[PDB]
Amino acid sequence: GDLESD
Amino acid sequence: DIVMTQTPSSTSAAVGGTVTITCQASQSVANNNYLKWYQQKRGQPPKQLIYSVSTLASGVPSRFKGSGSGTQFTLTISDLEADDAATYYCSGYFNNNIGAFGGGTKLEIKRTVAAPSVFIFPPSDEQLKSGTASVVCLLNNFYPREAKVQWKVDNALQSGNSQESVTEQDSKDSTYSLSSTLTLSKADYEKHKVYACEVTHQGLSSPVTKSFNRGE
Amino acid sequence: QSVEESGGGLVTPGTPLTLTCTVSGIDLSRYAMSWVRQAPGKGLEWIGIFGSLGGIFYASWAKGRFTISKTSPTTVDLKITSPTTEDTATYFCARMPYTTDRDFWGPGTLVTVSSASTKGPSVFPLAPGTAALGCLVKDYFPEPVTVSWNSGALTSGVHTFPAVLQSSGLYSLSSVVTVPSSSLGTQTYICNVNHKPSNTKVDKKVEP
Known part of the structure; x- marks a missing residue:
């Protein structure tokens, strides 16, 4: 899925 | 699994010298730039040095330089000071939303012999x-x-x-x-x-x- | 923007253990939190993450062994499933961005997995151009202790050695300081030992 950390 | 191989395990250099640390990830980091360099001391938590592979953290001296190519990254510390005695870690994030660290690199500062x-x-x-x-x-x-x-x-x-x-x-x-x-x-x-x-x-x-x- | 871990200390093998991470000025609906650990003398180990979109991800080796959850807008939990000796380590909660410098780590909280009982230390004095003195902080459990000198006024030339686990299963530590030899009859030297696991506070007079 989409990234969940920056 | 995911491995971030950090070399050397330990090294020494004198004040004003240069040390080079390499971090090798088993796959490309997320967005090709989820890669940070840390400095850690004993009684303390780690302190950021580099983010986005090469960007210098606020308040960090310019003698810390970050580099790399997709899967291999380099932290270069020039003009060494005594304060640089610490353990350095690479910190990475991966597309499956998974983080990992290198095994760390302990840096000893050489100096003239001092008798106890x-x-x-x-x-x-x-x-x-x-x-x-x-x-x-x-x-x-x-x-x-x-x-x-x-x-x-x-x-x-x-x-x-x-x-x-x-x-x-x-x-x-x-x-x-x-x-x-x-x-x-x-x-x-x-x-x-x-x-x-x-x-x-x-x-x-x-x-x-x-x-x-x-x-x- | 600050982080603090809680719930650490001594736990019995097999007893579930929940650590709590408390943030202030950080939006967990928009930023991720990570759980990291560090065994004594070893490297950092990534445990898991609560993502910006509510995703929860664990290292391959940490799946099952840990459960991460968000319990309140300001708290994130790390439940260590049936703890073992190898789970003894300092546990960090961190706002650890890879692409920004808004990087905040908690100070870390030590989790000790052992059947031994907590024990407050005994404090003994190490009496004396330069002179040395110290405090033997003997037989305590678990780690850690803190040692100051003259309530923080004395800091230069202080060496507080790391603890060594004794064959009895207890820890021993020494804290020394170098001072001018002329000052011995003139000034007081006091070591302030604090051992929080036992809620012990001891002040020891060091004299020639």
């Missing part, structure tokens, strides 16, 4: 009252770290009844300190007279001996 200052401490009366006797030998502010500390009671070499502990490298003068603690009972303690700590170090022309006579 040696002190011996007999047990306290409060401790003798409690039925135990610990004799302490202190090697203070020396370099390099390698040292030989042996105990002799009435000129009999002890074995297996002592324990050594060493500080981290000081970030100001780059020295180490070491304690060797001899653990006896009160009975065995009052059995003897001469208690001696013998210290061998590159900074000492010949082994130094610090001794005391029990009950004096």
